[PDB]
Design a protein around this ligand. Structure first.
Ligand SMILES: COc1ccc(OCc2ccc(COc3c(Cl)cccc3Cl)cc2)c(Cl)c1
Lengths: 262, 272
């Protein structure tokens, strides 16, 4: 039925008994580069089962006060097994994804989470200096980031944070959040479903790019209807994020990249 | 101006054929492609060399002269036709030894009052007369030579779109020579040193003649100056014998050099 599914990729399987169908972004399933759209001339590496499998990133907790969370792809998976290895050993890389967000509660809980997949999800910074966010802050990895309820300008001139300041109702980029529904999405309304499943093809203005310099997709999760339970002002339910890269192919092998951190 | 070949997929090798090894002493360049030294994938090539054709490389109007006339002998000026008065077009032409093409000349004319608060003049008309080598050159801005009964003239009204005319291939040889390793005279044994001496690399003393420019209106005591910028574009181009481009500053009409003889910067041998 629309509600029961099983996803198998490599050596990993995911089962769900409360789905609300699955979304295939823009109606496009991920695919490899065709010869007619090929650019780099060298033989690509395609790890296949070693990289195209389900990786579970860290679990976040939803509370009445949560504003939202965000992650960047392939960034969030840079340290994930052999996918991360191939990402850093190659100059160029390409991949699609199957994003599976998990969140179960009970029949006496309420709340709705909007799960959006955004191509080129550029976020707003914290200073008066334009495009000032530094690489280390823009790429948090598997832990991702969070949305805020208001904009707060960083004034420390001696030691600028050079970080993002994504305000939730402004979708972290100066647009109204209610219009974010034009992007592939699903809603995890506690009275209806457990999860949200989105299949994302590779989207870019090029056939292949640098995975370290460029993040193709952004995953934004916003509480559309806040978490509430029985009468417990105190309520916490975890949100686990499991993502699997698809049709990975890398070009331009050399020595490994070791990016600067923190 | 066409397509480039596709990249064919290439796998591993273990053979007695070694395209990587060669011997440049022969004077030939090793025609290798990526698949000769690495494993390649099949790529359908869609890039073309449409913009690097000899025609597209020269298909631009380049400035070759700025003729100036002061409508208060300066009432008229004469410019000896050449492409060596400027450096940009000259350097591009000199990538080749010989050339053959037609020419398109566009004239951009500007004028202004020298005085911010003095004088006035009605709209000016200019006459650009071509004086082929041999024809009488004007001595005054208004002598008989300006009747142009045979010389081609162009009358330009100030403010009108730039004037433009086309000239056929006018060389007396089968192609224009960008380089001429010789003289126009051979000094003979016995003659005075003053005799038989000529410039090295020069052909005719007057190759293509010159342009005589003047303002046709009667000059008013007002101080005015006009400038005619000449733009030339080679069209229907054919070129022969490539040469390395000019690396140091030009020093005259010849290949002479003097000043910027150290064009390259310093860089460590093992510095990326
Ligand atoms: C190798 O590169 C070359 C070769 C020959 C060249 O000049 C030959 C040449 C001969 C006659 C005329 C005369 O053209 C004109 C006429 Cl009819 C009427 C009005 C104005 C002009 Cl302008 C103009 C140029 C140049 Cl500029 C570059």
């Amino acid at each position: 039925s629309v509600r029961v599914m099983q996803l198998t990729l490599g050596n990993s399987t995911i089962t769900t008994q409360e789905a609300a169908n699955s979304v295939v972004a823009y109606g496009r399933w991920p695919e490899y580069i065709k010869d007619s759209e090929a650019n780099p001339v060298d033989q690509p590496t395609e790890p296949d089962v070693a990289a195209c499998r389900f990786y579970t990133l860290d679990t976040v907790t939803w509370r009445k006060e949560s504003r939202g969370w965000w992650w960047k792809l392939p960034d969030a998976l840079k340290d994930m097994g052999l996918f991360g290895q191939n990402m850093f050993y190659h100059y160029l890389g390409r991949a699609g994804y199957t994003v599976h967000v998990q969140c179960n509660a009970s029949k006496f809980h309420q709340g709705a989470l909007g799960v959006f997949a955004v191509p080129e999800m550029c976020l707003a910074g914290d200073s008066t200096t334009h495009m000032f966010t530094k690489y280390e802050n823009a790429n948090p990895g598997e832990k991702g980031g969070e949305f805020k309820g208001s904009f707060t300008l960083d004034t420390n001139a001696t030691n600028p944070a050079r970080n993002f300041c994504p305000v939730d109702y402004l979708f972290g980029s100066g647009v109204l959040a209610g219009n974010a529904f034009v992007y592939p999405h699903q809603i995890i309304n506690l009275r209806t479903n457990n999860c949200a499943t989105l299949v994302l093809p590779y989207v870019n203005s090029l056939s292949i790019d640098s995975m370290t310099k460029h993040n193709n997709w952004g995953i934004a999760i916003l509480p559309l209807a806040p978490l509430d339970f029985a009468t417990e002002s105190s309520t916490e339910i975890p949100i686990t994020l499991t993502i699997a890269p698809m049709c990975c192919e890398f070009n331009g092998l050399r020595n490994i990249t070791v990016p600067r951190t923190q | 101006a066409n397509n480039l070949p596709d990249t064919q997929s290439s796998g591993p090798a273990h053979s007695k054929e070694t395209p990587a090894l060669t011997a440049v002493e022969t004077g030939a360049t090793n025609p290798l492609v990526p698949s000769d030294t690495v494993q390649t994938r099949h790529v359908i090539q869609k890039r073309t060399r449409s913009e690097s054709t000899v025609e597209s490389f020269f298909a631009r109007g380049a400035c070759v002269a700025i003729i100036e006339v002061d409508n208060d002998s300066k009432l008229f000026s004469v410019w000896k036709i050449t492409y060596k008065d400027t450096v940009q077009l000259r350097r591009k032409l000199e990538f080749f030894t010989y050339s053959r093409f037609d020419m398109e000349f566009t004239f951009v004319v500007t004028s202004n009052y020298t005085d911010a608060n003095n004088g006035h003049a009605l709209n000016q008309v200019y006459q650009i007369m071509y004086i082929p080598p041999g024809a009488p050159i004007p001595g005054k801005w208004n002598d008989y030579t300006w009747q142009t009964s045979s010389n081609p003239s162009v009358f330009y009204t100030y403010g009108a779109p730039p004037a433009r005319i086309s000239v056929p291939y006018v060389g007396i040889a089968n192609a224009y020579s960008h380089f001429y390793d010789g003289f126009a005279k051979v000094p003979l044994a016995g003659q005075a040193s003053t005799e038989g001496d000529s410039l090295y690399g020069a052909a005719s003393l007057n190759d293509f003649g010159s342009l005589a420019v003047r303002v046709v209106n009667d000059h008013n005591p007002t101080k005015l100056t006009s400038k005619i910028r000449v733009y030339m574009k080679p069209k229907h181009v054919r070129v022969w014998c490539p040469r390395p481009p000019r690396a140091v500053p030009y020093y005259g009409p010849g290949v002479d050099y003097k000043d910027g003889l150290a064009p390259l910067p310093g860089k460590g041998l093992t510095t990326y």
